[PDB]
Each structure stands twice: as structure tokens, then as C-alpha cells.
């Protein structure tokens, strides 16, 4: 239950039931992003 969540469950997989009040709008996160240096013109890729 949601009231029984203690500090012993931190960074552990827990299963909990409940009801949903609100679902937010979809934010846009970046998986693969290509970057370029401003003056150095060095190209790099970051995969997250």
C-alpha cells in the first residue's frame, strides 16, 4: 500500500495499487543528440 512505503523500499522494485488523478502532457526527451562546437566545429554524438 502507498502508506506503507518506507525508506527501506528506496531504489527497490515495488508494486503498489491506486487511482490516477492527472496525466501530464508528453515532454520531449532526447535519446540520440548530435552536437557541434560553436567555433571549434567539432562534431560529437551523445546517446542517452
Amino acid at each position: 500500500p502507498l502508506r506503507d512505503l518506507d525508506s527501506e523500499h528506496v531504489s527497490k522494485i515495488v508494486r503498489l495499487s491506486g487511482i490516477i488523478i492527472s496525466t501530464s502532457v508528453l515532454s520531449s526527451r532526447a535519446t540520440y543528440l548530435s552536437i557541434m562546437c560553436r567555433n571549434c566545429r567539432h562534431t560529437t554524438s551523445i546517446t542517452i
Partner: protein, 628 residues
Amino acid sequence: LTLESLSNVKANSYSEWITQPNVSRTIARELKSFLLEYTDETGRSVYGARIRTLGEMNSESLEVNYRHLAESKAILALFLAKCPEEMLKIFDLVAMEATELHYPDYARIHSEIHVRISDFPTIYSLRELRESNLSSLVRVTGVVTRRTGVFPQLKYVKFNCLKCGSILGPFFQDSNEEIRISFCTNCKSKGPFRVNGEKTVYRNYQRVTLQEAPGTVPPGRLPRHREVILLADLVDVSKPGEEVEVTGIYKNNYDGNLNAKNGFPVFATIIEANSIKRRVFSWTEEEEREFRKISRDRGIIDKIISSMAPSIYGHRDIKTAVACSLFGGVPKNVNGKHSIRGDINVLLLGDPGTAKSQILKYVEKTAHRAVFATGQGASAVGLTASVRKDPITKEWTLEGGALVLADKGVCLIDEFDKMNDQDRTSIHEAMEQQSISISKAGIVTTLQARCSIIAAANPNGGRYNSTLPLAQNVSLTEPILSRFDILCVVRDLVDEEADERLATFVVDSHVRSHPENSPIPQELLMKYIHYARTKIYPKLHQMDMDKVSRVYADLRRESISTGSFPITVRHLESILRIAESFAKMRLSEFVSSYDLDRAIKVVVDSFVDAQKVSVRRQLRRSFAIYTL
């Protein structure tokens, strides 16, 4: 060192004296001696038993009485009272070593033992806390008013370096202030370090507002309030609205740039709780066999009716109705398609001064889940579900209302007559489908409202009319009136001897209440009601068919003959449901013929008492065989 040497203080302050290493070692040694060989001159060591109990129960809380430590080492008691912080830390270490001695593997499972000091001698109220109580142990009584959620506070903080990526060792986080590090010991840099929550250990944290109880406040003055901080094992032990007594360190909270509004260096104070003592429907096997022993006797149900509302005199029929509502029947769903309600709704319609509100508060005290609501009042939970935004927290909350909140319980509605339209629609939806549908703020759902309803109402004009039937004596319409299984009408008719007994009862209650001066016990009855509600589930068998169907056809013809409002099938349904509740009173798995006869009696008495007196005179003679 010695205790006599410990009494003499060489440093400037107590905290500096206790912080000294040889002094701290002496304190730890004496605390270990007190923890090991203290006895109450009875041949038994109580603290070894407590250590063994917490070891076998896997608990990190050790209860240490203050009077024992005071009579054993009074200098340690004075030192604990004056500077409790490092003394409590030292005694936590001592108790950890002590429980490690009994259990060598207890270190890897807990690695932390909290000592809960009990029976502190002095007791303070919240309004007499002063400058001298700062950084000292205090014991204050109060009502818990509001509490926050349980949050994780850093305990064993592990950092990582952003240059090399190495995760650094655990650092203990005290509750006073944030800890920080500046050296890596791997790449030898002072740059940015980051806390990772994956390897950091956390403890539970809670904030509780403690208010002075209104019975102890001086007349013209306002009740003071404090913030109490609850650590890992003390979370969720005090519900709001209850009286507790909390012992803890009265310390000074730190805020940035002080308070600019006051213009003075004014500090806020908090109480870090070391222990909480409160100033439960759990039954044991002995409680079970006591319930069975008190079940087999023949006249227990009357005794149950005798035990309902001891402060109310002479109103036996409504006591029977409330007892049946508290026990209840069983709800059923034949083949999934067709659902039959299993809880009895009671309507107490009465003139003012008939003590209906006292009975409602009795149900509040007695029932497992009793939710109180009112129509005219405002300082109560509403009957309507809503989605509300907190102005300060800026978050949404879905409140089910009193009907949803009383699911698998009872809802106690005071002043049922004067509800508004929205509450009336909520009540009708709650008794119709036993569910409440909400479509608000993007939330479209349904909530279960399987709640038994006991309502209190006043007649139109403030006085019941016997010549006029119940339909025109209330503002309730027919669909909301027909859902009640029992319609208990109480009228304060004049009677010389009845007024004599009522006056003597009230005057005796007043005399017994002066400060200068056969019923079941309540604490057994509460668990008995819960046990019957959650374990019995009676069923009625097939050869009892020939009597209830006979009496139904017998009384429908009489209702036609008298020309009243008709008896429909739900009257038979209420007869059967009240009969199955009478079986739960006896802790019986089957419904007997006596339960059926008693349910028929109570339903017939409820039906004829709601009639016009011209109908009543015919109906009492017509139904004399079933009323008995």
C-alpha cells in the same frame, strides 16, 4: 573514572565535558553496566528480557525507563536530562553492542538501535516552554492536529566524483545540518561531487503538528502549537485528532537570514521526538473462545440490545434497529447479474430532545469504520465526492466524501431533513447503486459506496403529526424514503411514569458526573461486532420458504384493505436482511425460525408506526399475531 568523578565537571559546559573521550568512555561503560546488571530485586533482569524481545521481534526500538536509570545512576539521569543528544547517541552505541552480544548477526540487518526514553518525571505544557528548555529533554502532552507524509532523509550518504566516477564511502548524516565533502581520495580533487540515491541509505521522516488540548488551555488564551519531528521508527504512530504524550529534545530550527518581518533575531523551535506514548480491533484465541462462550447463551441478542447506547434510556426499538445496522446482513450477487444490498439503513425520525445525536455519537465510538456527516453544518466531511485543488500545496486531491469514505462501514448523517440538492443526489446515488460516479477535472470514474446509512431527522414543523402519515411529515421524497429498511419514529408523548423514570435517569447522570463527587462491556462488544461482521456470513435454507411467503401475502392484503401506501418486495427483502443480521448476532451460520419471526416483528412494527393513526388502529389489530 568513577561516578563520583563524573559528578565533578571540569569543562565550561556540560556538552563539552561529555564530549571528552575518557569521559565518554566512562559514560559508555557505566551505561553498559546499567544495561547489563540492573534488576528490580525480583530475581529477573528486565532489560535483558527487553533486548531479547526486540531481537526476536526484529525491532530497532529499545524502551528504557527513566526512573530505573535515575535510581541506578542518578548522575547519568541528570546528564541525560540536561544534554540529551550525545548521551542518546552514546547509549544507542551501547545498546547496539549489547544486542550484538546476544545476536551476533543483528549488525548486518539493522546496524542501528534507537533508545526510547520512557517515564520522564517532569511534564510540560506547550505554553510554558522557554529559553531554558532549549537543547534539553522535555515531555509534552498534546493533540496531534495534522501530519505530513513519510519522507526519506539521508542517513549513510555516499557521494560520487564527477571526474573519475568513483563512489565514495558512506558518511553519517546527522539530523542537525547538511553534510558535505571536498576531497576524493582517488583523484585528489576539490571539484563537484554528487549524491547518488541508488547507494545512499535513507531513514523515515515525518512532521507532526502538536496542539495543546483544549481542556488544559487557560480561559482567555489560545492553544499553543509545536512541530514534532519523527524519525525512522516513529512514523505513522499518531493519527490526527488523538491525544498523545511525546518526549523529545526541544531544539532550535535554523533558517536562512532569520526573520525579516520581525526585525529581531527570532528563532523557531521544534521538538525532535525520542519517544511517543498515546494517552484496535485485534482478537486473540482467548478472545475468540470468549466470543463463542458468550454466543451460546439464549438471550444474548437482547443483551446486545441492552448494550447499545447505555446513556439512552427506554428507547428499546431504535436500539434494536441500530444493533441490526451495526451487525448487518450479507450482500449477494446471484450469477453476477443481479445484486442484492446487504446492509440495513435506519431512519430515526423524532421530535427534538429524543437523544438521536447521542446515539449517532455512540455509533461513531462503537463501529469499526463510522463516518459522521451533517447537512446544515460545515465543519465536517461532505457527502459529495469532489476533486479539489489546495491553494497552498497547489496539488489536486480526489475526495470520495462521507459515503465513499464509509465503505464497508457505516455513515452517520445528522439532520437528514435539511440537506441541499447536491448532497441529496449523492445520498440517492449511494443508496441506489452503492456507488458514486464522478466526472470532474478530467477524472471520470466510479467509487464504491457500500456503506450502511443511519440517519437522524426532525418532522416538518418540529413536531410529528399522528393523524398525518410519515410522507407528509418530512421533506424527504418517496424514492429516498423507500430505501431505508427501518423507519423508527420516536415521539416524546406525555406520560407521567415515563417522564418520572427519564427525569430520574437524567438527574442521576448529572449527579454522578459532578467533579466534586447484564449489558455487555463495550470493549468486548466492539471486537464482538467486528468479528461477527467479518467472519459469520449466514445462509438461510430452503424449507423456511413456506412461512415468509405466507406472511408477505397475508400482510399485502391487509395493506390493500387499510388503503395505506403499498408494501412492495423490498419490505420482504428487508425482512430477510434483518433476519440474516439476527443470525450474525448469535454467531450462527444459519438463520433460525426465531430470527425470521423477530425480523418480521421489527419490520411490521416499523411499518405500522409510520402510518396514519386511522390506519394504525386497523393495522395493529390485523398484525397482532406477528407483533406478539
